Amino acid sequence: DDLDALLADLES
Amino acid sequence: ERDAFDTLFDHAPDKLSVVKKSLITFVNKHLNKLNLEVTELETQFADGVYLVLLMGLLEDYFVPLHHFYLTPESFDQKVHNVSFAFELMLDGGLKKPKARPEDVVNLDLKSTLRVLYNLFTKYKNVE
Domain residue ranges in chain B = 1-127
With b for 16 or more beta-carbon neighbours within 10 A and e for fewer, the A1-12 pattern comes to eebeebbeebee
Q: What is the dihedral of CA B121, B126, B24, B37, to 10 degrees?
A: -150
CB proximity A9 to B under 8 Å: yes
Maximum separation of any 2 CA atoms in chain A, in Å:
17
Method: X-ray
The Cα B22–Cα B43 span in angstroms is: 17
Length of chain B equals 127
- Whole-number Cα distances in Å, B37 to B27, B33, B45: 8, 9, 11
* Residue of B16, B19, B116 to mutate, interface with A, max A Cβ within 10 Å: B19
In this structure, which CATH number among 1.10.418.10, 3.80.30.20, 1.10.3430.10, 3.10.129.10 belongs to the domain B1-127?
1.10.418.10
Q: What is the dihedral of CA B31, B89, B70, B20, to 10 degrees?
A: -50
CB proximity A8 to B under 8 Å: no
Q: Tell me the shortest Cα–Cα distance from B14 to chain A, in angstroms.
A: 12
CB atoms within 10 A of CB B126: 13
User: Which residues of chain A make contact with B18, given a CB cutoff of 8 A?
Assistant: 7, 10-11
**Cα B6 versus chain centre, distance:** 18
| Cα torsion A11, B95, B88, B73: sign | negative
The Cα B87–Cα B28 span in angstroms is: 22
Q: Which residues contact B58 (CB under 8 A, 6 or more apart)?
A: B30, B92, B119, B123, B126
Strand stretches in chain B, DSSP E? none
CB proximity B121 to A under 8 Å: yes
Q: Tell me the shortest Cα–Cα distance from B11 to chain A, in angstroms.
A: 10
Q: What is the resolution of this structure in A?
A: 2.9
